Design a binder for this molecule. Structure first.
Ligand SMILES: O=c1ccn([C@H]2C[C@H](O)[C@@H](COP(=O)(O)NP(=O)(O)OP(=O)(O)O)O2)c(=O)[nH]1
Ligand SMILES: [Ca+2]
Ligand SMILES: [Cl-]
Ligand SMILES: [Cl-]
Ligand SMILES: [Mg+2]
Ligand code: NA
Ligand code: NA
Ligand code: NA
Length: 331
DNA sequence: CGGCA
DNA sequence: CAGTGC
DNA sequence: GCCG
DNA sequence: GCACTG
């Protein structure tokens, strides 16, 4: 269990005894990430979380290797940093990385698009604005480039959640609306607001997206849509942009998901995160012959069985994990 | 060797 | 499908 | 990158 | 691990 972050409280990271290592490794991890070397970047990310939660400063190659998530190669970098105070590789990162990071911070442009723009000679957002062929999503991402990189005070996230909740409950007073993500995990600032909507009668969540989005558009609250499949009535998620009324307001990202009550615990667990907490818990489930999604915890396919999970605690229990409140899932 | 949700 | 983001 |  | 685009 020591090897699974989802089995451990994330508060272990608040006492990082190895910051002089992790701040350097994070530079490299991001360099691999924006260049598209996603699995190497994942290994770095996991190693950083292992170093952040370790109980003491690492001081030997043997100690480092013993830590789950640190191997020979990562141990060698750790030993370099301690002796020399520096990591030579940081002076030999691809010169494209700063521009790739600039470009992949456009919403809807990932590593493949950023690398293509770089190959085509683009180096600035002015080059993108004037010369690139943007998708509809990427054009919205660029228009809101700075605002999507800002985090909002959690008090503003509360206002946004309440705006959604009031619009929803206006046409069905029984709808339950909960802000998840970093808000539910108790963070002081939030990159966006992630709102989960359900109805305890098990049926009246159906079809609400059309009414809800139209309502939020009527009041001018929604300003742009990034993902919203409104054509066939099977919509599960909305990703877009909102802005509260009055002066001094920024455009803020807003995510909504609507789920049947029978899936509430698994949807709440997914949407609360964190992302690395979810990936850890889902990996653990696989080792136990199970599969965990926002819909269900289910046994391996043959057509698996859906396990009964009325509450988040039941998912933890079925995976043999001690329960963690949302604030302790911040991996 | 291959997954890594 | 590949690419993208939650 | 690391893991089984 | 899933739901989106085009
Ligand atoms: O890769 C991901 C990203 C998110 N998620 C889940 C967990 C996350 O907490 C939730 C909302 O995604 P956000 O991108 O909104 N992240 P979060 O709310 O944790 O942080 P932020 O403050 O940046 O929005 O979706 C994943 O499972 N995998
Ligand atoms: Ca979100
Ligand atoms: Cl590099
Ligand atoms: Cl619950
Ligand atoms: Mg969020
Ligand atoms: Na190790
Ligand atoms: Na992007
Ligand atoms: Na974010």
């Amino acid at each position: 269990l020591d090897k699974w972050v989802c089995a451990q409280p994330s508060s272990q990271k608040a006492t990082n005894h190895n910051l002089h290592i992790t701040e350097k490794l994070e530079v490299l991890a991001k360099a691999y990430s924006v260049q598209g070397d996603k699995w190497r970047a994942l290994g770095y990310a996991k190693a950083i979380n292992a170093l952040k939660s370790f109980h003491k400063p690492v001081t030997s190659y043997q100690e480092a290797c013993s830590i789950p998530g640190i191997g020979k190669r990562m141990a060698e970098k750790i030993i370099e940093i301690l002796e020399s105070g520096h990591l030579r590789k940081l002076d030999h990162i691809s010169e494209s990385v700063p521009v790739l990071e600039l470009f992949s911070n456009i919403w809807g442009a990932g590593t493949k698009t950023a690398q293509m723009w770089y190959q085509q000679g683009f180096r600035s957002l002015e080059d993108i604005r004037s010369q690139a062929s943007l998708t509809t999503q990427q054009a919205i991402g660029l228009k809101h480039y700075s605002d999507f990189l800002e985090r909002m005070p959690r008090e503003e996230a509360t206002e946004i959640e309440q705006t959604v909740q009031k619009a929803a409950q206006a046409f069905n007073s029984g709808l339950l609306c909960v802000a998840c993500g970093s808000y539910r995990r108790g963070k002081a600032t939030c990159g966006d607001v992630d709102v989960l909507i359900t109805h305890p009668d098990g049926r009246s969540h159906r079809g609400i997206f059309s009414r809800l989005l139209d309502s939020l558009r009527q009041e001018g609250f929604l300003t742009d849509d990034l993902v919203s499949q409104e054509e066939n009535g099977q919509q599960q998620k909305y990703l877009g942009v909102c802005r509260l009324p009055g002066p001094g307001r920024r455009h803020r990202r807003l995510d909504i998901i609507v789920v049947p009550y029978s899936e509430f615990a698994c949807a709440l667990l997914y949407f609360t995160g964190s992302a690395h907490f979810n990936r850890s818990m889902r990996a653990l489930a696989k080792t136990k012959g199970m599969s965990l999604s926002e819909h269900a915890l289910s046994t391996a396919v043959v057509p698996g069985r859906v396990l009964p999970t009325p509450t988040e605690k039941d998912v933890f229990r079925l995976l043999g994990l001690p329960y963690r409140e949302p604030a302790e899932r911040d991996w």
